[model samples]
Target: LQFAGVNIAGFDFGCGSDGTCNASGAWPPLTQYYGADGAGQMKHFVDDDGFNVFRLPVGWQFITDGVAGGDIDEDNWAEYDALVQACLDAGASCIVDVHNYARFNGEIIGQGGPTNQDFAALWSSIAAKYADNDKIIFGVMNEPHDVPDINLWADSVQAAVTAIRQAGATSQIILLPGNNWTSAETFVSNGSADALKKVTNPDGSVTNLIFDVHKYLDSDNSGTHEECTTNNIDNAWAPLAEWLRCNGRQAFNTETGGGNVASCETFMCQQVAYQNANSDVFLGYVGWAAGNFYQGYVLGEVPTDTNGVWTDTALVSACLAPNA
Candidate 1:
């Protein structure tokens, strides 16, 4: 697993593409977020599960104290950074993901809501804070959808990328997200492929700029279902993989997984194996969630903790972080 891991989703709690969040209370208090030992969960994944990365998703509101495109709220950021430092301490690569879709409070970034520079400021401040951390990856945005112009969205993405490099995060990998929730199936079809390819670094090179993609195995690929109906080989991974290799680009599956059911167990393995076969362009996948979520959560990927030992979900054991 090149960057196999799970999304430690506490900071992004009660948030979505609509910009609604419980940031005022800062829901999911730091220590209590993971339910059990939060740090222990990450440590276990890194040390025992053979996983190496964790996406630390956060609501844009939480970071900015409900201010769109504002600088990090020092107090709030302190708590979030604590989580990040813990991941680093656990010896895992941590993805700094902004959970807000392209919009902030019902507005698109660059189109109407936040200015291109405003969006850049968000990343600029973040990139500066973790400039020196090699294990840190900049996930430009979560899932951008419903934006009328793909080029404008790409422009916004380019602004963020440029800001990150300028803020001294020059070499760390930056994940570029496109429209339609950054879906792998319609990536090229939706024109995200053409629009995002032009997002270059300060030096005009695309080094360390990996495309961020999400794909679920359910029939609709919505990820809301427990039983998966597809492996996403022919319809998603195959086409996307070929495009990446052809363009000399790479993509990282930031989110992908199903439930702990029989159907998921049967299909998830095939999906992971297919990705393994095309590892040349696929950087590996991170399951939808685990951190702080209830065990009965719809798409629970968090392992059950029996005392100090961890028992992984069936999908995880067979595919995501398999014991090989």
Candidate 2:
């Protein structure tokens, strides 16, 4: 596999009153949740878990505020920059995930609310910040839904991609997710895979771009439960894999995992093995999350100990197994 990773969730969707940004809207930095002792968790994943990628989710509102008035917030930028740097320093590629579900607050960009230009501006500033780093990837948005026009959403994604390239951050790969929460099962049926193909570079090229999709083992394919739905690989993943192969596009499963149940464990193992076998079209998979989550979080798959050591649960152990 090209990359095997874990998602770090706190910085993206975490909430707390830091007395700096809006209390209700503000997302505390990773340090606030992980603290100084756990600050080295990224390194722990790379060195101990043998992971080569780390997906760090951050809110779009926080990003817009971080660079409000065209000036970067020194404190906010410092914390984020340090976190990404920590991942890179540990020899892992960092996916800077904008976990806003394709909206800023309650408004969806380019969908009767924020204009596509607004979305482009956010990427422009962010791309410039990481222009010098190629290992840093830009995930345009988390999941865009309720989009009446998939083509318009595609256009907005193109605008963001154009803005990123225009800012001279051309080398980094961009992961584009379609509407309907980027569900793999519906990717081809809902016309997102076809529409999102319209997103291209400034020179009209699609190089280094990969589609991002998510799937869960729950009955509804939502990551809201601990139960496993049978035949997830055959029922959900096979079709998605075939679609990607048929379209001649590459992709990565940015989010995928289930509870520690026996059925979920078997399902996850098969899913990982499938991705590993089809490395040509599937880049890799990143478990939903592994950091700053309290026990009993349905999707939680904590892989580290208190001493920053990589400790494998049943799921992580299965994920690391060789294809069989």
* Residue pairs with clashing backbones, model 1: none
Query: What tens digits encode model 2's per-residue C-alpha lDDT throughout 267-317?
Result: 777778787888988888888866667667777766555553456566766
CA lDDT, candidate 2, residue 191: 90
Residue 317, candidate 1: Cα error in Å is: 1.5
> Candidate 2, after superposition: displacement of residue 70 in Å?
6.7
Task: State model 2's lDDT.
Answer: 0.74
**Which candidate leads the pack in lDDT?**
1
Candidate 1 TM-score versus the reference: 0.96
Note the clash tally of each candidate.
0, 1
Least lDDT summed over 10 consecutive residues: which range in candidate 1?
Answer: 27-36
